Symmetry: C5
Subunit: 361 residues, 5 copies
């Protein structure tokens, strides 16, 4: 199609052909090439790459995480790139731990330690990242930290009357929880443990008040003090949660995926393209945080839905005017936050189940 | 439906009966609750991104959080399926009200390091009413120890003063701020069976002596106990706000003056379709001073069941501000004053201060 | 006749005391001063200067702005007894704000000391001492009496100790304007307490008439510097207009002697006698040079001396170009011509004479 | 014949040593460097960086700017003995400013440590160690000798202790460029003291020829990372031009083996052979990508290898678009094409060969 | 004499001021700029406020020069018109007071050279201060600063005695003949006040600067000397030479008379049929007022010092008219000053009575 870099057939063939497409390679070059200003230049706490892109500080933790989930799949696709993905993941962990990334926790007034109680959006991502790094590299560099954080998450789940952990105090999100639970499966695979036994209770919990099973859509958020559930449904919330859950209980996500597509996905331009509504009671696409379409593109990949992948990418990429200069990829007009991050991830994503069964080196 | 309007006056007044908010009020609760980090009721942390994006002056933030809270109280009465949400929003309102960014002007001006210990009745009046409404909506004891402490300070300060009430900044007496303090005593009494509201009679007799012009049904700007001075201008926004709050405590008082107030300040225009409110006497100009005369009159109209004036004022206020609903969330492209989305939200849902006092429990 | 761009007749301004009411434009100025929460200059006793930030007042001038507002408020208390309690409350706030560090702090930053009253600094503390006294004449309140006695005694002891007659501003800077304010503040204390601190005034009047005036031109020299004995060799209109106005309340014969030569030396009448503007120094045709306040202080002098003709001429020059407008019963100027503009026009319009402020009858019960 | 927009012939630049005088445009560059009170880069030994503020030099690059000035000044000392005392004074100031926290402080802010010399950080301390030595060759001054011995010994002990040949920059970042500077700095110390620290060089040359070079294309890979063992899979022109230039002074046969394949791989001749520009990596037609210094480092390599033709071609590409002007006998560029512009063109024009700097005769 | 276009007063008028015992009306209007307006005039008070210099956009490193040149001017004003001598005194008292503020000398500490600006080196700052202390006491007869003057004079005498070259450095290992000239003159001033013989050091200094630091064929000093390396920067400087010869003329008039003609040959360009002149800053260029851009303005001071009415007129015809002067409310401003220190050096040149005459200033 016009304005696109490579065929959907090409993206889905990467694992089989044991090589990334030339446009994915040009994204790894943006990530790795230029001294000082590339995001994966060094382990140091410098965020020049994110300053140049105008990434708000609250989002930096999400950007580092999504890069890392992408790099994990790259390690599976081309074993000649596994050592590079490893080095990039070592840097990802190193930068995730800087105060610039987690410091919003202290400034808001919630505490001086980001890993001690609550804050499941930050520490969920960190714990999954610790695990993927060790699956890719076979390095014990972060094992002591990984065991400490895994145990904190296990003890907090055990002690709570609802199934899971909160983000900021009295804010419960199904997305962030999905990341935490997956991080337990990764630890179990590495150590032979059974922390993932908590998962069944969590899956039963989110199916009670936190989902509308007719529409296959989760509600925005839950608040344990009042017991309140915000009465709007969210596409970006649901796309992200179902994608992560597919790697733990594939039957759960397969049950709801069709109703999710019915509820939010708009096909247009005689079936060539698709865009995703963020909530119900509107005609508008990519409202709220504006990430409905981009997370759906990751879900489509996770579920092997070639048709929807192609439709969404035909909507997302061409207007953003991509260009390759000195073998490096840039976008002249990115359409949302986390843009180059989520398109990178969706193009390479091998499935969360596959990342769990990653053959060691 | 007049042009540029979102819903009929009949629709707004029917919300309690139909036991559901209008679709435009729901889209306002979405602005308040939906977007991560930048919505005003995202979390109980001390972050005011929502107010930075709206360009709110720091001295006014305390008023914005309060008026949101009075609105959320009525939403809890209208639709019991929303009461838990209103409760969570009110918990966040109290939490943010207590941050130094909100009360810190008190210290910076040089008046003291503690905002509740003495005087400062504009800030702590609002806080005390908020503590009470949160407990009426939720049945939660989370803030009860703080509520008792502040209520007792207010009772002891009233008792000790030779005039009836408490000052804002030292030697500044305002009837608006006092009205909020006294109402907060009625809310405490309803929760605990006490009789702090016995102070109300003396206060109502006091403000009717030198602080009102009873011919025009308008309070004077301010009183200053050291000199005994009363600033010689009358104020619409002051009067609209005071009569609205007093209506919940002594309905006869506000019903006596409401007609003279409308005569004194309200201009009907555009063949009766619209109204706009003058801020003081001796001028033809509308919404002078702090520019909130019209918007507080819209709240008074609602409080006193006046459908006609409500419709006229909203026809003046809303259409020029160019509202639009996108992804089921309400924005205004050109808000006409400070506290805009706050006072229109409040006026559209407001169930009457009397009704908030008699709010049935949750269990 | 009402000339164009003017709000009220000169006849109207001079009749205020007789009619026992301020003009509607003076009332609209008191509304600017008092009405709006937070941003009006007389909102509270706190140390916030939002009113002055919005007007772009440089910090070194804030002390002058609060003082000239206060001298105006004193006359308003004489004009309309129904406004005297309001003037009192405004004066309480004036004193309170005068004492904030934002107002006097230039003294410390420049390196002259950490206390602004202890010694020298007669521009700041002269104004403060007169303000303490006017507050007590208007209100009958003893709120500031202990402070007033302490500062009055500092000024008395410093005059007594100096070989020249008076006190310096910054070290080794002697200005006749600032001194005039200090000496007047002693007359105010004497009136309240029955004392005789004003006995110093004669020596001071003899001193300034020696080297510090050109008696041919009826004009004081810019400044004197006691270490070197130097007198800056330029004469100053704003200096002279301000000094003669204040002295008129203490020794009226002194100011009456020089007023005609002062007008000859600096005042240019133009536009067929309808208008006047004031040159700041000699050897130029340019008006309102230097600090640009020659014309505005002359307008105050004309009022002090009962010269209705010159008052009218100056105000015809000053007000219309500044494009005044009344909105919601409050006065603003869209294009003020100088610093201290709304302050000095307010003062000149209401000013009852410094003599009259001294004889202010006590408050009602 | 003088091509258009150029200040002097290639023949003129290569003749400087023989004629025992710098060209008038090189002299006008020394005037920019030395003339104006306070704002010239070589005004005083103080920690003031006004010259670099005016030019908008990012702080991470200041260490490179001071170093390249210093390598240039060393050759100026060889060309014209009447200027050797001036070069010495400029080099004393170069060292003095190199040691200020403004220059090395990125190390601490990044979180890597409070001492920039103690371990790793081979980009900063490699440059410093070479500068310490060139200063002493030019002047014969022992001012910095105790510091030079301490840093040389640190570098020797760190090489000895590492399982790969060389030292990292930031932790777990290995660059062949930075290493090349460190090893050369050992040869300079040996020449001054009669020691044998340069015995480490052979192992290093054998190491970089294993996984860190593609010998078919005569191009080094971007970087190596010892923890993972990863080699970033792109080749780099600026990396290779700089490395071959420095290595030529230690093992000339090594650089002579790969120089032709390097030119084949990256250099584009155009405008009927009058001009050249350099691609930064493979799989592109674009010139001077990445840090945008491919062409400028190739110009230094061409000089090092005595390749007059390529020198002329590159300078015809680089100088005229940058619109140079000489005013009151001082050089400025109205539109410099990259970072480190006046620095690398200065260096390339005077460069006498790294071998010649090593054999610099005493001051007399 | 006819008034050339854009000029305020004839050269004949400026040179007659001492004889007529009155300053021109344009000099008086400059003293008004200096003294008239509350807070923002440069000589308002002894306080450490620099509003006058903020409004003019004076860089902080230059403030010390601005206060000094005002002070040299005010000294001559005291000689011209005895009715102005007490005013000049008061202005000089303020000059000293402000010279001592950290805003003026603090660059010394920030650059890292020490916490005390007087104790050692820093001859540009303390030379000026010492001459100012002396001129204040010649004008006023006041002992206010005498204890400080004796302390600083002795420091300068003891540092000269201890150095193997003749003089004192500015910032470490920077030797300038200009700054030295100010220090030595300040010794002559002390001697005149106290009957001492500190000026005996002057002969050795004059012999020193005539060895490597001057080209006697061109009558021009070299830019700077650097004692560690022994290097002399190989460019000659007009502003350096104009300033040095002007100050030396008060100490050894024969020295300055020997070189003045060769100086004019070397740098001064007459143009517009002899009506105008402008001064080249160095050799090997046609450009005027390069570098710090003060060649012409310091030459105007030298012309005055040497009684050369012709060159004075030519230079002022070049400098003043383009700067578009205007007198408003009897005060002088320039709409478009041509350089730094503009109103300062034109003020000085117009009143300057000769450094010899300042030395012989009769008591008050």
């Amino acid at each position: 199609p016009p304005g696109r870099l490579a065929t959907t057939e090409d993206y889905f063939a990467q694992q089989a052909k044991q090589a990334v497409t030339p446009d994915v390679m040009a994204q790894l070059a943006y990530m790795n090439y230029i001294d000082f200003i590339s995001p994966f230049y060094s382990r140091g706490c410098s965020f020049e790459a994110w300053e140049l892109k105008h990434t708000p500080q609250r989002v930096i933790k999400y950007s580092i995480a999504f890069y890392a989930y992408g790099l994990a799949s790259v390690a599976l696709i081309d074993p000649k790139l596994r050592a590079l993905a490893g080095h990039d993941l070592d840097i990802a962990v190193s930068k995730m731990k800087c105060k610039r990334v987690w410091g919003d926790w202290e400034e808001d007034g919630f505490g001086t330690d980001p890993i001690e109680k609550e804050n499941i959006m930050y520490k969920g991502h960190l714990n999954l990242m610790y695990g993927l790094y060790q699956l890719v590299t076979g390095s014990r560099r972060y094992e002591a930290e990984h065991a400490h954080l895994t145990r904190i998450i296990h003890d907090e789940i055990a002690a709570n009357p609802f199934a899971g952990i909160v983000a900021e105090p009295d804010n419960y999100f199904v997305q962030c929880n999905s990341v935490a639970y997956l991080s337990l499966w990764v630890y179990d695979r590495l150590h032979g443990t059974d922390y993932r036994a908590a998962t069944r209770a969590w899956l039963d919990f989110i199916q009670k008040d936190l989902i509308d099973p007719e529409r296959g859509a989760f509600y925005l958020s839950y608040h344990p003090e009042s017991g309140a559930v915000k009465p709007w449904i969210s596409a970006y919330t649901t796309a992200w949660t179902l994608a992560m859950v597919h790697g733990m209980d594939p039957a759960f996500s397969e049950r709801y995926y069709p109703r999710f597509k019915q509820t939010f996905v708009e096909v247009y331009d005689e079936g060539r393209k698709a865009r995703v509504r963020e909530t119900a009671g509107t005609d508008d696409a990519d409202g709220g945080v504006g990430l409905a379409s981009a997370f759906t593109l990751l879900l489509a990949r996770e579920m092997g839905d070639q048709q929807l992948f192609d439709q969404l990418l035909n909507h997302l990429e061409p207007p953003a005017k991509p260009s390759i200069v000195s073998a490096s990829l840039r976008y002249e007009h990115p359409g949302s936050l986390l843009f180059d991050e989520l398109l990178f991830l969706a193009k390479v994503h091998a499935g969360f189940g596959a990342l769990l069964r990653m053959p060691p080196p």
